[PDB]
Symmetry: C3
Subunit: 193 residues, 3 copies
Amino acid sequence: HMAFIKQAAQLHQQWYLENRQVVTIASTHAPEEQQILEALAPYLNSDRKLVCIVVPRHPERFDEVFEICQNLNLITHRRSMGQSIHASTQVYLADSMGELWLWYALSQVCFVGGSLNEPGGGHNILEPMVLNVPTVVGPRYFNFQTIVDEFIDENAVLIAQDAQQVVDIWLACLAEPEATEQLVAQAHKVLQR
Amino acid sequence: HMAFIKQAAQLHQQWYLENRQVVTIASTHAPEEQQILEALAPYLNSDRKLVCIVVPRHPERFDEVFEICQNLNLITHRRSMGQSIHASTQVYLADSMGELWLWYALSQVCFVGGSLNEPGGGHNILEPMVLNVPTVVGPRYFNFQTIVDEFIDENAVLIAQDAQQVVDIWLACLAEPEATEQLVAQAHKVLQR
Amino acid sequence: HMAFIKQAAQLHQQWYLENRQVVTIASTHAPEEQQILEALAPYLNSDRKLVCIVVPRHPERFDEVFEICQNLNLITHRRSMGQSIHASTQVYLADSMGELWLWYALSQVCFVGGSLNEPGGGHNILEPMVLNVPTVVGPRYFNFQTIVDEFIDENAVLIAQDAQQVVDIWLACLAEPEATEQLVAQAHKVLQR
C-alpha cells in the first residue's frame, strides 16, 4: 500500500504531472466510461493540461474500454504496454491488476464507479478518501449505503446524478482549492472517528 | 478443507463455544446483513448465548458491513484484527479471505446469501450440507436452481421468504434437536446418491 | 497462452477429436447451460460425432451445471475428475480454472455466454476470434458493446436471439465450410486493424 504511495512520487516526477490536472474514473462499469469520457472530451481537447486516468473494474473489459477511447478520438496510452502519460496523452488507460492505489495517489479528483450504471451498487470509496482525493459517486451506491451516507452527512463526498454532473463537479473542484481543501478536511473527520 | 475442520475444533475449544449458539450468515450481499441482523438483534440482546458470524461475499464490503453492525449497536469483533468471539461478542465479522469452511464448521445453523437480495441468484449450499449444518436460503436461488430443488424435494433445505423468516426458522431449529437431526439426515441422503 | 495451443494439439490426438464436431459454450451463466443443452440434446443423442464442451463462468456453479447435464440424461465427463472426451461423451464439463484458451483451441464453433441471461452483458469475444473459432453471442452483450459492434459491422460474429438460434447457427456453420471460412476471414480483418 505504502509502496504505491512512493511509486506515485516517482511517476509524478518522471511523467511531469506537476502541470497536469489528473482526473480519475475508478472501478468503472459500462456505460460509465463512454458517458463520462463523452462529457469530458470537449475539455480534454481544449485544455491539454487535463488527463483522465481510466481504471475499469473488470480486466476482461480493458480492450473494450480502449475501443471506447479510440472511438471518441482521444489520444490514449496504456499501462499494459508499459506506456506513460505523455504531454499528448488525453486518457491513460490503467489496464493492469492491483494498482488502483497508485492511480488514486496520482489523482486531483476522482469518481468511483459501479454507481452510474443500472442497477449499479457502487464500490469502496474509503481508498480515495484515505489518500486525500476529492471523491464523486453516482446515485446507485447501495452496496456501500452505510459508509457513503456517513460521508454525505458530513459533506465529505460528492454525489453526481449523471456523467455531465461528474464532469461539472470535477471542473468546479479543480477551480476551487478552498472548497476541495474543506471537502478533504470533512472526509478526514469521518475517517478518524 | 480438512485442515479447516481441525482448526475449527481448536477454536471451538479456545473460544469456549460449547455454550454458545452460533448462527452464520454466509456469502451475504446488501441488504441481507442489515435485514437479518435487524431481525436478530432483539435476540442477540436478550440471549447472550447466541452469536452471529457474518461472512460478506465481497471483500471490498467488509468495512461497510462493520458499519452496519456498529449502527445496530451490536458488540462486533473482527477476524481481520485477530479478534476472537468473546463472551460479549454478539456479531463476529469474519472479514478474511478463504475461510468460509472454518465458519460453517463452527455453526449450529446457517443462511446462504445472495438469495434475499434482488435480483439475487444464490450461492453454493453444498458446502454447509457436507459439514452437517442446517441450511436456510432465500427465494432467489436461481443460479443454483437444480441443486436447491433436489434438496427441497427431499426436505433437506429450508426456504425463507424474508429476513424475519430466516430468524424464525433459525430459532426453531435451535429449539428442535430432533427436527434438525432429521434435516441433516435428509441432506446426507441427497448428498450420497 | 501458446502453451494451451500445444496442449490442445496433444489432446486433439489423445482424445481422437479428428472425427468429432466440438461445440463449446463458454463463460456461461444460468439459465444458458439448461437452455442451450436442452436445444442441443436431440442432436447429441442422434449424432454421436457431436460433443459439447461447457465452461461455466463461475466455479462455485460447476457442480450445479453437472446436475443440469445429468438431468438432461446426457453422458457427461469432467475435467475436475481427470476425465477425457470418450467416444460416448456427449458433454464435457470443463470444470477447472484458467483453461478457457485450451477449450476454444479445441472447438469447431463456440458461444460466448453471459449474453442470453437477463440482464446479461456478455464476455470477451476476442479470445475465440484470435483462435479462429466461429463465435456466437446472445443479444445482451452491452458490456462489450463497442467490440461486438465492430465485429457485427464486418459480418464477423453471429448474433443469436435465443438458445434454439444458437444451435441453428452452430449446425449451419458445421455444414458450411465456405461460410465459416469467410466468417473467420472477416474476423481476422477486424482483428488486424
